Symmetry: D2
Amino acid sequence: DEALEKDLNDVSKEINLMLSTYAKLLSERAAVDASYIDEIDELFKEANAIENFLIQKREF
Amino acid sequence: MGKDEALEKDLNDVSKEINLMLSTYAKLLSERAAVDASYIDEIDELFKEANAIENFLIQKREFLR
Amino acid sequence: MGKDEALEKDLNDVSKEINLMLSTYAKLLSERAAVDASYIDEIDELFKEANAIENFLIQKREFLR
Amino acid sequence: DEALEKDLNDVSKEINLMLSTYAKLLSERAAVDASYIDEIDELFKEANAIENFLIQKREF
């Protein structure tokens, strides 16, 4: 029984490790997503500003 | 209208669709993060609940013997 | 019933809830991947559409001059 | 005009790079998620097997 209770406790320690590691991983992914969203938004605005300026020149 | 006017209007419609998809996906990601945090916390809580009951029983049986 | 019987039944209910949350989150992740692939492909397609129209106009104006 | 058209093209090349890098990043995240789901499922089954066995002994 002692051996199986230790085995049960060792598995629970492995589970606790996995859960907190994945929780931290999800925390890091959200920060990277936000950074990608900002960079693409900035690039899309740079391209759109050049496009709108050039379109205005051709029309006028 | 001319071919250039039509294509420039198509370009404006494409840029409007891109802007909409970007904000929609950005909002979608924010909803997932709130759901992810909720699921990870509840599952961790359940795992600790089960582990606490086990530790209680193991300790109680130890007093018994 | 005794305190041990009640706690063992609570343990079984906790394990059933854990199994349900795990499969629910696993299924949820699969739905997100299909949506992610769909959004990334459409946005990339829109960006190439706008870039193709730009390249066409740039080439057409080049013939004009 | 030539300078602005180059600037517009350079931004579009930066956008294309960002989109494909993020698409690959999402592809890698799904593979890691699947691996975490398998490991936790295995650990949860190991712990549940030990628990069910011990509960059966105490009852019987």
